[PDB]
Amino acid sequence: MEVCLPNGHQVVDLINNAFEGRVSIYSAQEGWDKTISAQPDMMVCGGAVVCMHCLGVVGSLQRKLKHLPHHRCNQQIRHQDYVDVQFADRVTAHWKRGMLSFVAQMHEMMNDVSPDDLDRVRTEGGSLVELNWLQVDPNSMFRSIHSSWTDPLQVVDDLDTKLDQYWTALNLMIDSSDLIPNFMMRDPSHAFNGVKLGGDARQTQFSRTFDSRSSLEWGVMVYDYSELEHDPSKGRAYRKELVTPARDFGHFGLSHYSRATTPILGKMPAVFSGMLTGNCKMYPFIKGTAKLKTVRKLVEAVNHAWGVEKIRYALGPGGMTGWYNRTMQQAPIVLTPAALTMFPDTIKFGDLNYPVMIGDPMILG
Amino acid sequence: MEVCLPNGHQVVDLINNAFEGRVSIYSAQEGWDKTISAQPDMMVCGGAVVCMHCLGVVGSLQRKLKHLPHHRCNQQIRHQDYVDVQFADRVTAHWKRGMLSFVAQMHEMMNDVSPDDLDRVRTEGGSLVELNWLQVDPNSMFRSIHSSWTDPLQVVDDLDTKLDQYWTALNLMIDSSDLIPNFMMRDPSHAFNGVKLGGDARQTQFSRTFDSRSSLEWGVMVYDYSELEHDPSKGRAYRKELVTPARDFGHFGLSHYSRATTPILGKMPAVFSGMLTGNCKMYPFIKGTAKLKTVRKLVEAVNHAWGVEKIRYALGPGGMTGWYNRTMQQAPIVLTPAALTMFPDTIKFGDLNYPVMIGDPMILG
Amino acid sequence: IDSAAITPTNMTQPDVWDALLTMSPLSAGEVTVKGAVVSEVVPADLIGSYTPESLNASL
């Protein structure tokens, strides 16, 4: 049995799923599970099963598969060709799990805040909760120095629903008590360029993506409002009227906008969808062109190992290189979640007011 | 001329039109008129003319018919098979006429009530009007032993328009004067179960359907508000704030909710559609399965008479019995007028607080 | 369908069936009458036994 190449929209869907962190990967020793890293054999792209040895469409989601079906596979594609996508997927999964750990710690602690202390905080400003930045996922590859992306994934069931519940509850109590967080940003692009750097953070290098060369071992960034509390002209009323996030983002409950966070983990900002969309989904702030950059070597391998007429009939006009160029032109929308472009247009408080330093997150008021 | 059987949705339309009592009957002695009882020959169902002696389609509404067309008739269908539908239609017509008489009598008394009486009753609570319970339906089925279902129908014109006009005028007058009638219910099901019976009414039996194996002779049932007007703590302010129908149903001028009445005639509650829907129509409170049961004998007659292939190709999968079972399963959706399930849900005054007894209708402010 | 639980208040549509459906047979040896398969068919009894609604809703 011979095979045929996939299509451009299918490849785009594969890229989107890879950068969101949900790709079905089948390995011989493990099967359809992804807890233990291994050499991929087949992957699902846009509803089509593709064999990694020769990038042929071997099946679909409509029928069950237990092994790699017998077929003529040219065996002309190496692990180096597609290692980048696997790296991005596993890094995204680790980042999501670490962020969920951080947010659930925040939620449980600031829930453990006592009512009398909460009332005293409403009356006069104070630091309700403080967590040492050394406690934020110590064993992650972003924090531990002996952890790699090939390490096993932590088993977290119902991950997205748990994350949504924790994030929603956290923001609801925050905007109900009119508190002030230090790990939220009005515009995440300012982190990459547009925020003053603290003394210890002056050496930061932002790769603005998840790549092999970049070093993802780094500290936890938070805004600095010690001078905010030390400000004499600063009052609780002024904090409420300006510093409160709801003054700019809008009330969490009736906000159709998107929230952003500081580069807490992996030096990569995260974006949360709002209530009015339907649920809170979390995405990295990676640009679409950076995502598309991962398949250049795969394009080269396909051009080297497939017939020109097959490529023309499968991918379309101009060949797979032409598809790459056209998708690069069309990237801002085809390879960009709608959440990333729903940020508030106008901010009275600003996002570049105060510096960012690598230290303990707190919720103050 | 060969003939074919009708279809399932046509039979369903026949049952519906029977239960709102508008089925057109053709008899050789009386033509298309239905005032005088006669043995039916053809009926119109689903826009098709069917011969009773064979239950075969003989014509349609596009072309006029002046006599029974010449056709091959097996003459295997007997009057006992389909007498139930005719009985239901005739009973529904008689019930509609009785209800029209009652409503028009009430409205003419409304008009005859004097303006100074209106002023006095609005100033302090009292019985604005009352009708003795003997006059309504002097010689009908539901209030006499001499009459029968074969008796000639009483001839009136534009019955639906008269019903709509009288009911609308009465309800607008009630809402304008903030009155309280003793014959309106929030939920018709409470009449069948959920209300305490008084004045001997404990012995009544609710067949909940128009059927031959029951008696349609019984007195009128009205609420007992004597204690309501007796209680000295209760004041006209309380009566207007809670006991007035507009407080629970809503303003009849602007409301889509349907009103209901006590079993005045034939032990059968009447439901009037809301005015905002476009017009007010009166529907008996009948269950869909009870409606469906009327064709049980006709099913067996058809199975005995017609051929298997004809039945399968006409009715559908499973034949007549399969159609019967499927329509039993889907009875609530199809065999139910929309107005019958569009009652108000929130209740404040309560439909079960006072007994129901055979007595004179009376309204008060 | 969503990877996370859907709050019943946010979504109220029963389904997404309000769309266009294209239906194509995958065989030429089966025949259906009024929506059910039959092994054999008598052509003479198909004459004058279909209302417009039934024909429109047929398979």
Next chain:
Amino acid sequence: AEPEIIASLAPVPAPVFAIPPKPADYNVRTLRIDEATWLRMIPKSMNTPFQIQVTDNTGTNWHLNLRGGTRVVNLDQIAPMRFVLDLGGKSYKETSWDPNGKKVGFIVFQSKIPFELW
């Protein structure tokens, strides 16, 4: 055209009678159950939606909500067939639900309980 086949009075085998067919178009939401014998509906007034989880062939889990008024297609006695669904031009927009970026799919149920009693 085969006059004797098209005018027979005795049963004729389906393979003999059949001819190459053509595709058909429908709108499921606007159909009527009495005419359409291959549709099943959860009766209204059930008025208590319930959530459910279903896993795909790969193993990924998904969440669905089933409420009153949901329709399904009876996949029995309809012969081998192919369905294609297109949602172009609809809105499906609510105050707390934005369709952009969401996912839709086909789910197949095998059960012994009639669909109306679910």
